[PDB]
């Protein structure tokens, strides 16, 4: 039973974050050193979080996705806030990043050492996102195997990278590896920039918030504590740091951050026609990534539509294919705004800060529950040290990393707090049978067929 | 609770509304098609940038010239085998070349005694040489060896009959190519007969062997016509001459000389060195090197520097110092004959710590020469300024661009603005952040108006600005 479970979690973990993140983590890491350390450390903290989340999953079984636990524990206020922050600034902006890096990697073939126009990249990203929205809609019967073919292209590309790198190291390729050639500091080693670099690896390790669905909604975990974490974490961090090693062995340090693309230049610097087979495979992988994110966030929309909040006129059945038509328009609008205005790596830092704040809130709530709960049944073995280690680590991260730039963090916490007035104005004052509230049902046909 | 009845929705669904749904779908797909068509148009009408010129190894990075290894190291440690210990320092200078001294056997103007196939035991041996190239290619420092019939006598190139002095060096070329060294330095060109054809034959042999090799030719002539006559056929040959060794000392004259040489050559590659093999210090006033380093380190070509130049070492200042072979100094113990004469403001360790030193400036512009493209293989156009001021802009077709200004007079200088002499692509802005200066008085990274340049005498500014489309 561990085979299919492992298949789905590693399908959810690996995305397109192994492409944009390396040159950012090197630009903010100071030098070639400590980059592998960051990529390993991220896997470690993600392992600790996955263990805590698995404990909560094998605990009391309330369904409803991810926001259900934080609605039931620590009040529904934190649950509504986390759901709002999700549907605003963790799914749509990540979808925007995925589509925009698809466009960036597609456009780089024609301009090898040249900056493409921004309008072409934005238009291509918009076209890709509309195509994937239509693909997720309508024909659901074959969309699953379409996404499976995309992930197969992903595995093919990554395996080819593994192959070329592994065969390459044997040809005495200790260049840009050993400390004699791995400790050149073009930029002074700073620890705030080290945290900013760690944010990119954090974005690369996204998807571990998604394992909570099917681990419980499957064959029952009869005290199956270790498998769900120790079949995922060490393999993926090893393959990630070895992919970074493979990237480093075929390139001088400067060429990796002296471009807007990490791959493609890899194909161009050696081989010659795998340089043409590779970017299309990377396009397939990011296609699968946006498709999977769309599927998961549609599941979010259904789960939130059950609870009644996040206004209930959303994600119904239309006629026959039972496809969430009203969900995908609300999806595409919040990413069309980003296609209108946005950049790449500031948004990467935004997403990293927001989702780590989300898991920190969830972990703190779980710890307060454990403090406040002497009852019910926990099938898992008690840990009592790794959660508090994660808690102090994450507190150190947020407190130390607030120095970076107030422009992103301030607006993020401002729209975090903006959920409060609508929350209380709705809970306390939706009982009034206003003309708008009475006639809200009338646009179920005026909005869709 | 706005859950509508399924039967109510089905009975509300009309064929007319189905037609409007089909119309909405068709216009949605038409909008997607229009986005694709706009992307195709804007990607097929885009300005196609040019390609990299695939320059060789010597086109990037400066060059280092070493006259005598005994003078470079010192008494007792002057053997050739000790060269490998200084490669860590030499790689810290970001210099991607090195020139050996004459290490063959030649006592004094003796054709029969001298023989170019053997290395004298005074310096080292073949095994030490092989270890030297092994350590050099372990690093990223190429090695260039020179040949000269006389490095002792004042008859430098064997004034006897010519074929016997030609065949030995002729076989020595392929002997040293099969040894492993790349490139050669040839000095005292003016002491030769049929030198143009001889240099053409040598360049032809080297190019027939390989393409990464080169051939450095040195002459003390300072005439444009003589230089053009020497380069009448060997256009690819790299030559260092005494062209810039004129007194000059004014920006208008320097503009005239540099522009005349560049226009006479065309736009081909050249070498920018002030002297044949001497230092910049002994042929120039001591208050000008802080700007001459930036001038030599930015002009299009390969700047060639003598050894002991990154600190401005002087031979005339120290008494009892032969001007041909000055002694390199590393600490206060490098000159045991006259203790106390040396100090900490010219030694290597002393200048390395100070950011306002010559060594710091050399490291700063050497870190910029290797890693940046625009001043590597960009263009070069100047502004028709007024008084003796130096002004030019270095740019590539798309990458970020550089501007350098210099002052040669003894009085303050104005902005000296001039424009409209460049294409629209090579348009300069009014805002540019300072990157470096000879004397630290300005804050780096601070943009300034380009019409308020209050330039101090004996000063030069390195300006920088992102590319503007
Ligand atoms: C569902 C909805 C969708 C919409 C929304 O909610 C969810 O999505 C949210 C999320 O997506 C948000 C974005 C997240 C990412 C954010 C990134 C942030 O960047 C920061 O911007 C600072 C502005 O000063 C600093 O950036 C540099 O700071 C230096 C020092 O002051 C300047 O020196 C330099 O300017 C330079 O001047 C000289 C020129 O030659 C250079 O070319 C130029 O770079 C600045 O760099 C940039 O300078 C530009 C011109 O001055 C802009 O200021 C730009 O930021 C702009 O900020 C606007 C503010 O909203 C934004 O609209 C716009 O698009 C951005 O280009 C800024 O970077 C800082 O180091 C940088 O980190 C930006 O400032 C706002 C930002 C984009 C946010 C805007 C608001 C959002 C969209 C939110 C919005 C509610
Ligand atoms: C370059 O270096 C030389 C040598 O130090 C400088 O002096 C010049 O040396 C040459 C040697 O050939 C002189 O040529 C002479 O020609 C007469 C013609 O009859 C001949 O009889 C001599 O035996 C000698 O060969 C030359 O006159 C002399 N001076 C000049 C001005 O060239 C030379 O000045 C340096 N600079 C240049 C630009 O050559
Ligand atoms: C550069 O050298 C060339 C050849 O000596 C000259 O350039 C030409 O000069 C004639 C006048 O004699 C002009 O009509 C041409 O337009 C010039 N062509 C170019 C490409 O410059 C001249 O001596 C030098 N050029 C300049 C501009 O001084
Ligand atoms: C480099 O350091 C030496 C150290 O001796 C400086 O020499 C000084 O020269 C002045 C000139 O009269 C003397 O009065 C001082 O006594 C000398 N020593 C010191 C310590 O100042 C030399 O001037 C320095 N170089 C420069 C350019 O300042
Ligand atoms: C060298 O000279 C020979 C003369 O036969 C010629 O064939 C060859 O092309 C020359 N080499 C180069 C690089 O032009």
Numbering used by the authors:
A (entry chain A): 41 to 489
B (entry chain B): 61 to 529
Study text:
The amino acid transporter Asc1/CD98hc (SLC7A10/SLC3A2) is a non-stereoselective small neutral amino acid exchanger (e.g., glycine and, L- and D-serine, alanine, cysteine, and threonine)1–4 expressed mainly in the brain and adipose tissue.
The structure of the heterodimer was confidently modeled for residues 41–489 for Asc1 and 61–529 for CD98hc, thus excluding the flexible N-terminal ends of both proteins. Asc1 is covalently bound to CD98hc via a disulfide bridge involving residues Cys 154 (Asc1) and Cys 109 (CD98hc), with additional contacts between CD98hc TM’ helix and the surrounding TM helices of Asc1. The four N-glycosylation sites of CD98hc (residues 264, 280, 323, and 405) were also modeled. Finally, density for a digitonin molecule was observed near TM helices 3, 9, 10, and 12, as previously reported for human LAT221. The substrate binding site of the human Asc1 transporter is in an inward-facing partially occluded conformation, with TM1a tilted to limit the access of substrates to the binding site from the cytosolic side of the membrane. The semi-occlusion of Asc1 is the result of a partial tilting of TM1a to an intermediate position between the fully open cytosolic gate of human LAT221 and the fully occluded cytosolic gate of human LAT125.
